[PDB]
């Protein structure tokens, strides 16, 4: 508070020095989800070349 | 919360200091306005329990012990008739609604039991019909005119106070 | 959809083709899970201003701190309608207010501690009304009151080009 | 803090000028705040657009200052009108307006000069030492009513 | 033939939920009270119609024709 | 590219504060009148016409 | 300064104090009357 | 340090490691000579409106 008033003697009262804001503690992502994959499997294991 | 913007904003100067100063000045001013208007009386004057004042019926304006908020019925009508982030905050007022209602009740009790006197110094009690005789005399009508029509005058005052609430409610 | 916030179990009935919820002014209020397709509520995590309550440098260095728009569950300690105040204890006595905190709460130096308390609007005077009684003054006192008022301010003139670039 | 208002006027004016002088140092996005360096270490074609920022920024600062002064001048004019009304009504006469010229029944008032305003010494009459009495609205004598 | 389309053809434009509020949007809608072409499904088979910007195709039938 | 946003948003916030100063002056005039009416009409009787 | 100025006031402090003394003498010796005429 | 102004004999006690003097609001008010180490006061010569 002294530093915000730029004065070594601060009088009786209420002074707004700064503000606070809670930072996030963790990060979560949830993205594109599919059930069925591609048919590469058959293609390669079809044993019919 | 971008670091680069603070890094670029520090070179623009003290605009934020000016903005904070201007807005706090406005807020403190709002508080002073409410004080200046309502907090004129120094002592909270109470209403006597036997509420008989010579036929006049102040029930519509005196505080209601029934409701928990302790507001008179007209005040209740007014409060119900009117109703109503990114770094923006609304600060609360210093005097809550309850304390303003208490100040208003003090002014009413003072004016009802003591007339003009409570504004010039110590409240001196005076019967309500004699107070209204004083005021009649004040507008150039002799006071006998009030004592001979006390009944009629009380009836007209009651009727007008009754129509006020209906008018506030019917006006859109 | 990228954002920050606290997620809370939702209470809104999303129709099956909807993926977002917004209040007025495009504030994203709700979201559907890309896995379980369940709706979640978004609230911006807590922020607010902090103020310092001081009884004067010349009285003592003790100080109390008021976090304005926040609840202490996520900051002696005290909760008020204006926020949580730390360093001052709540007392039941009502006094004439000197440090206004807000919402009817004030603070002052006890004398050895800083106490927060509810405001008092003055003493109660139950004037004795009666239908046939009058109070009349028998003496007087003439007083003098001083009232101050500003009338004018400093006249200023400015030179455009000099101020711009010398 | 009896003279809070006059002192407050003085400090606001001083603070406004101080910030106006201080805003000359900001770069506003320009490569430097002093005009000499900007015009020294760059060619004229680019120095034009690098000097534009300082010009526009300082012009905006000056514009803000003038607007703020217009608002404060309106406030002081309201106060000066009130002072003139108080002079006319309380000093040059006697006012029945309640609680205009001090708390209590007004007798007279005296003006005193101050550096940027006036100081009125309102003299008021205040009752004291009250006493209880019983009263009646009229007296009936000879069958007819008397009023005072 | 011709027939005015009453207040029909509006659709959810953004798959975004909004509750108890009014919203103004500029998008390709069917103007109210405009007349719309009418064709019949008995026989002749079907003429080509241009696709200017978007088509509002309405049909009341009960035989999957 | 970020300078533009900063300067533009700073201008927006400045207009808001100026508009608020004018409105606060208006409300202050009204509040002074209300205090005058309290003192003169409630705490006494006024001969001022209308 | 830097293009700043503080033009002086028109009534000096002495002339304002002289006006104030005039009002005091008038009100002390003549009451309301000096405001309505002679 | 480049500037313009009138130079006058100083009355200020510069400490031996200091080379410039500034008043409130960064106006460079004084300077010590790099040759004779004498302190000099700077005042902008007179200007005004007509
Ligand atoms: C003549 C007259 O008005 N007398 C009244 C009485 O009716 C009333 O009951 C009492 C208090 O309630 O005050 C007195
Ligand atoms: C003192 C008095 O009689 N006050 C009246 C009350 O009797 C009446 O019931 C009410 C409307 O119902 O209006 C008021
Ligand atoms: C240590 C301290 O501050 N003591 C103060 C002094 O500064 C002040 O001048 C005096 C009266 O004002 O009261 C005492
Ligand atoms: C300090 C504290 O617990 N504050 C609030 C509490 O008042 C409220 O009841 C609760 C749930 O609404 O959330 C939290
Ligand atoms: C130590 C002390 O004073 N505690 C009081 C408590 O007794 C009271 O019930 C409460 C509500 O006012 O405030 C606190
Ligand atoms: C100023 C004065 O004497 N007021 C009195 C009060 O003291 C007394 O309690 C009341 C009832 O007797 O009557 C009145
Ligand atoms: C003579 C007379 O009017 N006496 C009344 C009394 O009847 C009443 O109870 C009291 C309260 O109002 O006021 C007084």
């Amino acid at each position: 508070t002294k530093c915000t008033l730029k004065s070594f003697t601060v009088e009786k009262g209420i002074y707004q020095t700064s503000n606070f804001r809670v930072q996030p503690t963790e990060s979560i992502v949830r993205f594109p989800n599919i059930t069925n994959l591609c048919p590469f499997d058959e293609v390669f294991n079809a044993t019919r070349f | 919360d971008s670091t680069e913007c603070s890094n670029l904003l520090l070179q623009y100067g003290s605009f934020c200091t000016q903005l904070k100063r201007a807005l706090t000045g406005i807020a403190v001013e709002q508080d002073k306005n409410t004080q200046e208007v309502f907090a004129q009386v120094k002592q909270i004057y109470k209403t006597p329990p036997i509420k008989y004042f010579g036929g006049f019926n102040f029930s519509q304006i005196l505080p209601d012990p029934s409701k928990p908020s302790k507001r008179s019925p007209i005040e209740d009508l007014l409060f119900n008739k009117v109703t109503l982030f990114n770094g923006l905050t609304v600060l609360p007022p210093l005097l809550t609604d309850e304390m303003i209602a208490q100040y208003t009740s003090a002014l009413l009790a003072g004016t009802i039991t003591s007339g003009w006197t409570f504004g010039a110094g110590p409240a001196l009690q005076i019967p309500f019909p004699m107070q209204m005789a004083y005021r009649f005399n004040g507008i150039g009508v002799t006071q006998n005119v009030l004592y001979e029509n006390q009944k009629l005058i009380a009836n007209q005052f009651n009727s007008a106070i009754g129509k006020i609430q209906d008018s506030l409610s019917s006006t859109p | 959809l990228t954002g920050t916030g606290v997620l809370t179990e939702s209470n809104k009935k999303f129709l099956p083709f909807q993926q977002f919820g917004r209040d007025i002014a495009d504030t994203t209020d709700a979201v559907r899970d890309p896995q379980t397709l369940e709706i979640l509520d978004i609230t911006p995590c807590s922020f607010g201003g902090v103020s310092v309550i001081t009884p004067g440098t010349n009285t003592s260095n003790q100080v109390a701190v008021l976090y304005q728009g926040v609840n202490c569950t996520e900051v002696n300690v005290f909760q008020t309608r204006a926020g949580c105040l730390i360093g001052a204890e709540y007392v039941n006595s009502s006094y004439e207010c000197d440090i206004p905190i807000g919402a009817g709460i004030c603070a002052s130096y006890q004398t050895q501690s800083i106490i927060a308390y509810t405001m008092s609007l003055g003493a109660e005077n139950s004037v004795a009304y009666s239908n046939n009684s009058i109070a009349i003054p028998t003496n007087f006192t003439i007083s003098v009151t001083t009232e101050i008022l500003p009338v004018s301010m400093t006249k200023t003139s400015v030179d455009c080009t000099m101020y711009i670039c010398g | 803090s009896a003279l809070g208002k006059l002192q407050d006027v003085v400090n606001h004016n001083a603070q406004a000028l101080n910030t106006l002088v201080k805003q000359l140092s900001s770069k506003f996005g320009a490569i430097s705040s002093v005009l000499n360096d900007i015009l020294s270490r760059l060619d004229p074609p680019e120095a034009e657009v690098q000097i534009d920022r300082l010009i526009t920024g300082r012009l905006q600062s000056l514009q803000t200052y003038v607007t703020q002064q217009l608002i404060r001048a309106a406030e002081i004019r309201a106060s000066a009108n009130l002072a003139a009304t108080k002079m006319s009504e309380c000093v040059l006469g006697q006012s029945k307006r309640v609680d205009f010229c001090g708390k209590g029944y007004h007798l007279m008032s005296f003006p005193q000069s101050a550096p940027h305003g006036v100081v009125f010494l309102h003299v008021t009459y205040v009752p004291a030492q009250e006493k209880n009495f019983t009263t009646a609205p009229a007296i009936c004598h000879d069958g007819k009513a008397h009023f005072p | 033939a011709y027939t005015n389309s009453f207040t029909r053809g509006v659709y959810y434009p953004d798959k975004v939920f909004r509750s108890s509020v009014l919203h103004s949007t500029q998008d390709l809608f069917l103007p109210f009270f405009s007349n719309v072409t009418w064709f019949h499904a008995i026989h002749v088979d079907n003429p080509v119609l241009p696709f200017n910007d978007g088509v509002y195709f309405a049909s009341t039938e009960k035989s999957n024709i």
Side-chain angles (χ1 to χ4, degrees), chain C residues 154, chain D residues 8-21 72:
Chain C
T154 307
Chain D
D8 274 7
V9 166
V10 168
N11 291 343
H12 282 187
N13 293 155
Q15 194 177 68
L17 282 172
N18 221 30
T19 184
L20 186 63
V21 169
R72 253 187 288 271

Side-chain angles (χ1 to χ4, degrees), chain C residues 132-154 156 163-165, chain D residues 2 5 20 24 58 65 79 86 116-126 128-135:
Chain C
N132 62 340
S133 191
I134 280 280
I136 292 170
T138 70
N139 206 339
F140 53 75
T141 64
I142 70 181
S143 54
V144 182
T145 308
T146 175
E147 175 168 39
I148 299 96
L149 284 171
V151 167
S152 50
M153 46 154 53
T154 307
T156 302
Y163 177 75
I164 290 291
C165 41
Chain D
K5 298 175 215 181
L20 186 63
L24 287 162
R58 291 179 177 168
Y65 167 78
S79 179
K86 289 217 174 201
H116 278 314
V118 295
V119 173
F120 291 102
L121 266 64
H122 302 307
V123 189
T124 56
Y125 167 100
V126 176
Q129 295 191 346
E130 46 266 10
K131 196 189 296 302
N132 286 329
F133 284 116
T134 300
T135 66

Side-chain angles (χ1 to χ4, degrees), chain D residues 3 11 21 37 42 44 50 61 63-64 70 72 76 82 94 113 117 135 138 143:
Chain D
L3 283 76
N11 291 343
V21 169
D37 294 24
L42 188 44
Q50 287 287 334
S61 162
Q63 185 73 253
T64 281
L70 280 162
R72 253 187 288 271
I76 293 284
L82 178 60
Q94 187 183 19
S113 172
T135 66

